Paper text:
The ATPase CpaF in C. crescentus is the only Tad motor reported to date that is known to be bifunctional, facilitating both pilus extension and retraction at the flagellar pole through ATP hydrolysis. CpaF oligomerization is mediated by interactions between the NTD of one chain and the CAD of an adjacent chain. From these data, we propose that CpaF uses a clockwise, rotary mechanism of catalysis to assemble a right-handed, helical Tad pilus, a process broadly applicable to other single motor systems.
Residue numbers in the entry:
A (entry chain B), B (entry chain A): 80 to 501
C (entry chain C): 80 to 251
Write the structure that this text describes.
């Protein structure tokens, strides 16, 4: 129990034994064996007859502290602990079973915690310190890490690790939550696979980003996706992907890099799909070009309650871009570029479901005509206020994108999904 | 007296002997030691000598102006002082015993006062001069500073320092001060505990911060709360609160961490609630994001005089954030994000009261339709000038957030408070 | 195995050997002639068992890393490789026969990749850094280059070479 004191006695000697720089040069087990030998020699010199199991545990903990991730290691390796949050050296919380729960784990001081955080976030070659007090990273394992330095967090460094749960956003989850019928799931699979241009319009609180992340899961591994986001949220798991992020202007107003810049660059980066996190300005124009230029299969979220409202929003956005384009030209661009619009909305009872899956068919009389392949129809509600509905296929056997599915060999599945939906 | 004339002569000699640039690289104590050496060098030609208790006092006074905050140093050090105000180099007033009073203290010239003000505002990286003649900031020592430059202040630069006072009220204080009726106390308890998005709009001197503290007091201890503010205005008693503070840029215009960065990070720290010390910039948009993409129950303080005014403030703030968001999009985002607005204002008699408790209902055309749950009605003035008024409920049986109450099992409390509130 | 460690040690020794100004001023052949001798002397001091052809290969790799384009150079010299795409130091893809294939060749770390990107775009006189995170250029050879800095690319620089596809879009 008192082995901690022994560690307190030995830690100071460890640095006096071998400099941390020498240990940092090698990640091989040789460092671990050397640390174990040094710890055993120090224990013998101190002449302490501590528990053998306690001695081994102390040696392992010393190795972790010197070169590992400190007391976080038992928590980090555990599979049941979804998320770990640390607020100063004294408090640690873990999200287990979907609920927060405090833990007895502790760190000696904010200095030890800061060293652990710097090691963790430098694993992926990113810096965190009082000069750059805020840092966000994604480890290769897929677990996100976020660290805030003491100069911002008044209670010392704060850290949050969120592990990667795969089956948390897949289309199976959407079907389970009744956000889309299984036939709707099949249709969504076909559309996503066949590189149909997409625009995921959604109302506030509709989880547009979650729907987009689910949709992107159908992209073939070999396609060189490129993602532009105002704030990195998308977690694509394809072997090939490039993640970009905007940079707001500094206090001087200089150094800004807006989404339009990222999309314009992406046009010249040889992508096979452009996944705009959220179209929110003139960048829409450029995105539309990406949809015509040959980067078929791009996607982009947008704020709108109904597909027609989404089209109007895109037109307004392009108009605000300052380009000398009349309404007819903008509508022509939208019709020729966009292939499908998906609408996600938050219903009265707080649930969110895919309300519309519509295909932009063409332009007539400066009015953009759309046909809804799938529509969610409200049929009733419960005494709780829960609103109930059903997904109905409009019966359009041959949507104008049918050729795309045929080229990829998904025509049969598309017909099956459209017919069996009723 | 000879003290002032001797000090002026010594200051003139020191200025003719050295310049501030000669000691800008020295620290406060090092600067004082070098100033003592320079004083000895100057006395070598002036042959000035007096009692140590007086010579050292004169040296300290000279230092207080060479690198300190000028003759304000003896005043700021005091505690009976409530407010300091400077209306030009030749006049300064101080609030003692709750009443203003003229002091014999004086400056040398308006330029010296301007330099002192520049030092005080640069203490937090701010600059006041002809380019930006108006400046406001907070000294982290616990005070608020306002400065106006000569081009606006005709009588020379004007300064105002207001020292912090620890209010830290609790809902019992508000109830006993008649700031809110007991039925209003029950309503606010429900709203706080019900995880309802809540914007505490307030006017000047309304105490829209302490109101935020007492509102937060209702937060469940098990919810991870992350608070963004400046100079740690708030003080929560929950066991799982993360406290963050923005960092003003250094004099080099670098290292700044604005509210936008802190809120965007808090989005990624898995918080159950995001609480903003005060919304005064584009961060509002990022806050609204947090208010709807989960994180139900986030709060935010805003400077506005009326709920309908506060909504316009938020809309303009989002507009100036640089996004090309269509106005209707911003209005829809606000309608779907906010669930309640609380208005705090100071009446003509100087007392703070909760004028409005309103809930955003929806959007009609391009106007946000809101219904007021509680309103404060004024009826006259009493013998001692005190404002006479009472809180009345509109009688709305089922406010929009009712669902949340049902989820949290607070329907009975809310119904009782709304019915008996008349 | 040991070749990589010996190369890393020799690279560190060369970096500490002389200032970057001497290498920059010296011509490619002029600098390489002394670099080969320095590498041979370092190997002899280390007494590393290696072949004369292996010694020449190590010298060439050292020259490429220190002053050349690093492990990306062999891909550049190839003809079948039409496009090259680096998604950070740990991922390299090449477009051959109209198909994108991952290749095992990867850089030491994102810092080396950023240095190589700056060297590549220096040919046209353009410079990329954290203050100008985006860069695009057309080298004199005709190959296009697009580079993104880490502050934007959230997983390391995103070098993208697109070699000149002559007669790609002619009237035929």
């Amino acid at each position: 129990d008192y082995y901690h004191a022994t560690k307190t006695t030995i830690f100071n000697a460890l640095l006096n034994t071998i400099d941390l720089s020498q240990l940092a040069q090698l990640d091989l087990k040789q460092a671990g064996e050397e640390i174990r030998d040094i710890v055993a020699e120090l224990v013998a010199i101190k002449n302490v007859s501590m528990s053998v199991a306690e001695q081994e545990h102390l040696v392992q903990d010393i190795i972790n502290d010197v070169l590992g991730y400190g007391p976080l290691e038992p928590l980090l390796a555990r599979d049941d602990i979804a998320d770990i949050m640390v607020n100063g050296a004294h408090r640690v919380f873990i999200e287990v079973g979907g609920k927060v729960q405090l833990t007895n784990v502790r760190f000696r001081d904010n200095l030890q915690l800061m060293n652990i955080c710097q090691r963790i976030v430098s694993q992926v070659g990113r810096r965190v310190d009082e000069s750059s007090p805020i840092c966000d990273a994604r480890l290769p394992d897929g677990s996100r890490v976020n660290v805030i330095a003491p100069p911002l967090a008044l209670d010392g460094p704060t850290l949050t690790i969120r592990k990667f749960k795969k089956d948390k956003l897949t289309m199976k989850n959407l079907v389970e939550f009744a956000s889309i019928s299984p036939e709707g799931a099949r249709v969504l699979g076909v559309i996503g696979a066949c590189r149909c241009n997409l625009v995921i319009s959604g109302g506030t609180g509709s989880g547009k980003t979650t729907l987009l992340n689910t949709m992107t899961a159908f992209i073939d591994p070999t396609e060189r996706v490129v993602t532009c986001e105002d704030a990195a949220e998308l977690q694509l798991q394809q072997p090939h992907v490039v993640r970009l992020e905007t940079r707001p202007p500094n206090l001087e107003g200089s150094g800004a890099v807006t989404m339009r810049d990222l999309v314009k660059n992406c046009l010249r980066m040889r992508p096979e799909r452009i996944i705009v996190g959220e179209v929110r300005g003139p960048e829409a124009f450029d995105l539309l070009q990406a949809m015509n230029t040959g980067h078929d299969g791009s996607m982009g979220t947008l704020h709108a309650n109904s597909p027609r409202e989404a089209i109007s929003r895109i037109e307004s956005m392009i108009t605000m871009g300052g380009y000398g384009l009349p309404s007819k030209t903008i509508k022509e661009m939208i019709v020729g570029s966009v292939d499908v619009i998906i609408q996600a909305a938050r219903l009265r009872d707080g649930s969110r479901r895919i309300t519309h899956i519509t295909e932009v068919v063409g332009l007539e009389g400066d009015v953009i005509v759309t046909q809804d392949l799938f529509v969610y129809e409200i049929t009733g509600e419960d005494e709780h206020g829960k609103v109930v509905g059903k997904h109905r296929s409009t019966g359009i056997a041959r949507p104008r994108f049918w050729d795309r599915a045929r080229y990829y060999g998904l025509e049969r599945e598309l017909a099956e999904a459209l017919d069996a939906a009723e």
